Copies of this chain bind each other. A is one copy, B any other.
Amino acid sequence: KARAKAKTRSSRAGLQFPVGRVHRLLRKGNYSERVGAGAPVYLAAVLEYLTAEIL
Contacts and interface: CB of A to CB of B under 8 A. Distances in A.
Task: Specify how many copies of this chain sit in the oligomer.
Answer: 2
A24 to B, nearest CB: 16
A9 to B, nearest CB: 24
Interface residues of A, number: 4
Contacts of A33: 30
Query: Which of A30, A32, A33 neighbours the largest number of chain B CB atoms within 10 Å of its CB?
Result: A30
A8 B33 CA distance: 29
Contacts of A30: 30-33
Interface of A: 30-33
4 contacts: A30-B30, A30-B31, A30-B32, A30-B33
